[PDB]
From a paper:
Spike (S) protein, the main focus of vaccine development for [name] ([name]-[name]-2), contains 22 N-linked and at least 2 O-linked glycosylation sites per monomer (1–3). These sites are important for S protein folding and processing as well as for evading immune recognition by shielding specific epitopes, thus hindering the efficacy of the vaccine. In addition, a broadly neutralizing monoclonal antibody was identified from SMG-immunized mice that could neutralize wild-type [name]-[name]-2 and VOCs with subpicomolar potency.
Biolayer interferometry (BLI) analysis was used to measure the dissociation constants of [name] and its Fab binding to S protein at 70.9 pM and 4.66 nM, respectively. The cryo–electron microscopy (EM) structure further clarified the binding of [name] only to RBD in the “up” state, with the N165-glycan from neighboring NTD in the vicinity of the RBD-[name] interface. (I) The cryo-EM map fitted with [name]-Fab/S protein complex structure is shown. Heavy chain, dark green; light chain, light green; RBD, red; NTD, orange; the rest of S1, light gray; S2, dark gray; and N-glycans, blue. (J) An enlarged view of RBD-[name] interface is shown. The star marks the vicinity between [name] light chain and N165-glycan. The footprint of [name] on the RBD is similar to that of human VH1-58 class mAbs, but it approaches the RBD from a different angle, with shifted local contact areas on the tip loop, bypassing most of key mutated residues of VOCs such as E484 and K417, but not T478.
Author numbering:
A (entry chain K), E (entry chain H), F (entry chain D): 1 to 218
B (entry chain L), D (entry chain I), G (entry chain F): 1 to 219
C (entry chain E): 412 to 510
Write the structure that this text describes.
């Protein structure tokens, strides 16, 4: 009866902390110890260590030790995680792992969407049209679209022409540029038989902020 | 103690071969008593949660399909995927736990190869209509290319400009099973009109001749 | 004895208190010929439940839905038998057992 | 067989009596082999999707309410509700699953015993706030009228013009023993400045003379 | 105890895709099959058909015959019935029912009572009440309701005028107007000699749009 | 088994009645009864009656005698209760549990909030930026906040450092003003000698109303 | 019509004492046959619903441990918390079902005496800019101290104006287990322009001398 749910809805500004915990339950408390590990943009799970309240005292991986000073409940069978001196470096996806005396990692939890951004104000995506400059010698087929730059927050998946050609739109993993806002690109190839005979409209679907803008590409 | 190195990064894996990616463990891991060792192998779908493949360094979980035949202990470790399917294409990990701490590599992506083909490289000059906002963006973008082994070179005034961003590349495309590497450049409007030369040199693997994209102001 | 299955229900039942012996051996290397083995079939669908030691010789059309077929087939009225379509040069695993 | 769609509309049924949901089958009980019949009952109340009520015209399962009283066989089918109550006042339908093509009929929409009455015609001036929206909305509303197939007469500016008014009857009433029709007048504000009088003339059964109030220019 | 449950609010735009599913439960899927029905949103019920997936060939009634590509799955416990060129007039709920070797439509689920529009543009809800100006010389009683504008979808529950008469729940059958959203009205009886003691106040109780504005008429 | 499920807070103007019951199931209409329990914002409870299964004869509390309308449904073994022209102390959440032959209530339902308001729509409270005026000689520590007034419905959260720890979230025991709308604030810990090195921003982030507004205090 | 009184009037009592909760009945509860008294005591958690403690005056509920003891006699039977527990932190009620109507009291809410800590109270001078907003919202903050019988004192130029001040408190916390307060001030426009001094002065038990803050023109 293992039930693990990470929780806590907050949208956080720089300089604060974060607490992602697992509401563990189902079996005898001291039988297993349940430990934590870090995920950043689809890279290897960086395991940090663990604390046993039935053991109480603190000793971790030397590499991920000092920043945390943690409380944990034996009564609710709930484990919590918090490292201190938080900056953008530890802005990462957080998982908690169930120990087995046979193998180490087979069954994982939901995960959390925790990002420590550098105080980016909520601003809509500024559509930037792109047009050719030299002769139309791209080769194979024509390529035109609308550039998406300096937007907040994630994510963007672009639907095309009122929900008709909507298979295969893609989104980058998110990084913070020197610009101070996320700059992610999403564009698709368009058939070469529609050179003029079709109208070009961009339909960005930035759902979290509920902004919907229209623009014609030439 | 023990440190682990994941490799290779991106190389096609086929159906029916015996998978072998270079995962290194620095010391022998033969646990003295009962001579029983303990190992765990990962499979994570793209962005998903990981899962076990081979435990006890020799044996697999019961009830798992026969694509999985792995083992390894001490310094010897090797993941094996037989009949790699289109959904088995993702990144695989290796990790020991004979001794704290755990060490995790940079990531190993297995791919699927097909017949040689390449896309035409594009160039993206900014439209002059957008100049209403007061910003001009000259960007070099390569999108929908296979295999993933392509690269972008930044040269401005014959000076190498690098080390200004950390990258996280696109995954498989649904249309043509391709990828995308993109770098974004931001400048000011004032110097935009009095400076003209910004270009990128593309050396894609699938091209038979050196392609030199260039643009002229004013035609 | 005590097992179940579509074969055990509509092809051949066997008593729970069965005290006997059974002999089988491979015989598909000449009793078959290329072009699918429609010679040996197995019953899938039957409207009336079979009892132990009862013969199935009726070839009634399957009656799929609540609306009766009653002599007229079509939607929700589908044929109850299909062939094996096995290849003659396969191993015993793809082959019948002569009992 | 023929797909059943009842016509003509009216075949009187009563609430609380031996209720009759009348739909006949084109076939007798002449089931060719072994004589099995195939009859169902799906009756749609508010929101609830009907379940199994009757199967094979003679037997219901254990736990099925005894409201069904067996009567009729052959080319006819008729179901009687036992002690019709507030739970038993709803829209009625019947179904059989004997032969091609399978269909659900129109069913019977229930009406209850009470005498025909007159509409509650009254005149109400439009508020100043609503007129600001660009449309003039005068409410002309009717209460306590009957039957299912009725008609409403609309006359505009001494010229017989139809197809410019909206009419819809109200469902089985809950409390005040009243049926109603919702009419929201659909015109432009331009007509309000080039025409002066907007009045409704209702000529249903319940009235002796139509109700027509007169007003002066400017409300 | 075979149970199939509906799922998914439906506001279907034409020319779009549709997600067909029926969560079969209470039985191993190789024993009993699925038969489907459409409800004509307040017309005669419409029989269409189903499938016994042993070979998969099916024919429905005319409207559900061949518009799209017909599929089925005997394994993952889902039967498939879909439509292409979905319009407002046939905008209906995809009902499916378990079968019995005796009777075809055996068990339903909770169901989804869904009212569907063809993706008309949204319009803001503006309160437009109507109240008399001079004294009401009609005599005895009157009949008036309040306008609830631009709501989607159903339902509403309404009470009227401080319980002057204990009736006043009224939500009439509506028709498709040009605005893309239906129009609501009610009826109430209130004595006319209450100039000062009783007022006309309408509570917009459209749950989907979360609109709640009252008004005191002087 | 004995399951009684109630849900759905209803806001109706005074004078009408709402339809809420406590539905038992599975047993003949012969034996057991019911209680309703109303709590009035940290004041006495408001019992209103119980149903006698054998005859249908009803009980009144003497003070609120004629308030209850008498209904019973023997076939379903459960009836519905409705109250009209109640007073302000009955204007709150409704609770009940199926009455037990030993004691009063054992296991409950979710309940429904009914409060009598004077047709008042939600009017936004005035938010102002905060800057210190006099010297900080209050003593102990530093604490300041923005006054949030007249909110509905629950809950409301104003964030300090985007609300990291559970300090700054609270639920007051209920009190009724003229409109009965509440005033919720947050608690923050700040050193008294560090006035000038920190930023303090107050925003209204009422989740139910779909409100998200940006604001900068210099 | 029927009165039953709990006790005490107030008691700042701690976790770990032996707190007294009793609720009195109109007459002695004992009758001959079955030797039992129809009465039950309840505890309500904050947000949660009341839960049973004692029934029939002698025994204890299955699921309710021996922490609570069944005792008392005649008109009263006792609610005793043996070493009041960490999960007992909530209000304590009494319930009666011995004489109708079911009439209820407020119950016992077990607060604790602690030394007062003063929150940083400040007031913001209203500029003429505020008149544009249309609503007056002056801020005076109280928090993190005890008890509920606190004070909000309003002095304006040595004049006492009353009838517009209220209080609002929170419940017990885990660490300090004090409360959070919210008092709202609304003023009239007439007093707004005719005076320069308006302030709130807190004078709770925990201070030594009330402080008379003042400021000079010029910031
Ligand atoms: C020797 O042969 C005789 C006669 O052939 C057998 O005698 C019968 O034995 C049974 C066993 O107890 C007696 O019991 C009855 O069995 C009835 C079931 O049979 C029914 O279904 C048959 C199947 O019909 C389908 O398939 C046939 C194909 O062969 C088609 O012709 C039909 O059209 C159908 O497609 C029917 O043919 C048959 O008529 C029945 O409908 C059961 O219904 C009865 O209630 C009862 O249990 C039966 O009475 C005996 N009848 C006679 C005439 O002897 C005998 O078993 C064989 N073996 C031995 C050892 O004697
Ligand atoms: C489903 O249908 C079967 C009949 O279908 C039969 O199934 C096999 C046994 C084969 O013989 C098939 O060829 C054949 O189609 C029902 O079984 C029996 O049905 C008859 C109806 O003709 C029942 O007779 C009556 O049923 C009523 C019910 O109210 C009783 O009160 C009467 O006393 C009389 O028995 C018979 O009871 C029934 N037998 C059993 C054991 O059920 C089956 O009932 C039916 N099930 C459902 C849920 O509809
Ligand atoms: C783990 O190993 C133990 C050996 O003590 C065995 O009993 C158990 O079945 C193993 N678990 C699994 C999932 O194989």
């Amino acid at each position: 009866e293992v039930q693990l749910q990470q929780s806590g809805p907050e949208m956080v500004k720089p300089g604060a902390s974060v607490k992602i915990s697992c509401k563990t339950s189902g079996y005898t408390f001291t039988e297993y110890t349940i430990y934590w590990v870090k995920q950043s943009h689809g890279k290897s799970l960086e395991w940090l260590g663990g604390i046993n309240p039935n053991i109480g005292d603190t000793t971790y991986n030397q590499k991920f030790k000092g920043k945390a000073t943690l409380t944990v409940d034996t009564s609710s069978s709930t484990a919590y995680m918090e490292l201190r001196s938080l900056t953008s470096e530890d802005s990462a996806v957080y998982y908690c792992a169930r120990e087995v005396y046979n193998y180490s990692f087979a069954y994982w939890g939901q995960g959390t969407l925790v990002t420590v951004s550098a105080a980016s104000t909520t601003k809509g995506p500024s559509v930037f049209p792109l047009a050719p400059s030299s002769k139309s010698t791209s080769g194979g087929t024509a390529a035109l679209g609308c550039l998406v730059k300096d937007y907040f927050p994630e994510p963007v998946t672009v639907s095309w022409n009122s929900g008709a050609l909507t298979s295969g739109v893609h989104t980058f993993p998110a990084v913070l540029q020197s610009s101070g806002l996320y700059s992610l690109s999403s564009v698709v190839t368009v058939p070469s038989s529609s050179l003029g005979t079709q109208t070009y409209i961009c339909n960005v679907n930035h759902k979290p902020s509920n902004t919907k803008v229209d623009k014609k590409a030439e | 103690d023990i440190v682990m190195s994941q490799s290779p990064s991106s190389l096609a894996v086929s159906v029916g071969e015996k998978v072998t990616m270079s995962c290194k463990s620095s010391q022998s891991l033969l646990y003295s008593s009962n001579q029983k060792n303990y190992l765990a192998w990962y499979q994570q779908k793209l962005g998903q949660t990981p899962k076990l493949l081979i435990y006890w360094a020799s044996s697999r979980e019961s009830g798992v399909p026969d694509r999985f035949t792995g083992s390894g202990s001490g310094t010897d470790f090797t993941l094996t995927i037989s009949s790699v399917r289109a959904e088995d294409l993702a990144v695989y990990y290796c990790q020991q736990y004979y001794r704290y701490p755990l060490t995790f590599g940079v990531g190993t992506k297995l791919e699927l190869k097909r017949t040689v083909a390449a896309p035409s490289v594009f160039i993206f000059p900014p439209s002059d209509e957008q100049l209403k906002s007061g910003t001009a963006s000259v960007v070099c973008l390569l999108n929908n290319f296979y295999p993933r082994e392509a690269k972008v070179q930044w040269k401005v005034d014959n000076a190498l400009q690098s080390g200004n961003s950390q990258e996280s590349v696109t995954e498989q495309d649904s249309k043509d099973s391709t990828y995308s590497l993109s770098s974004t450049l931001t400048l000011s409007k004032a110097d935009y009109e009095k400076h003209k030369v910004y270009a990128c040199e593309v050396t894609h693997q699938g091209l038979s001749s050196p392609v030199t994209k260039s643009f002229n102001r004013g035609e | 004895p005590g097992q179940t299955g579509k074969i055990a229900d509509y092809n051949y039942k066997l008593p729970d208190d069965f005290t006997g012996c059974v002999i089988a051996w491979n015989s598909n290397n000449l009793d078959s010929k290329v072009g699918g083995n429609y010679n040996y079939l197995y019953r899938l669908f039957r409207k009336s439940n079979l009892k132990p030691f009862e013969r199935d010789i009726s070839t009634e059309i399957y009656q799929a839905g609540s609306t009766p077929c009653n002599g007229v087939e079509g939607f929700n009225c589908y044929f109850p038998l299909q062939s094996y379509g096995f290849q003659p040069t396969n191993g015993v695993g793809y082959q019948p057992y002569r009992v």
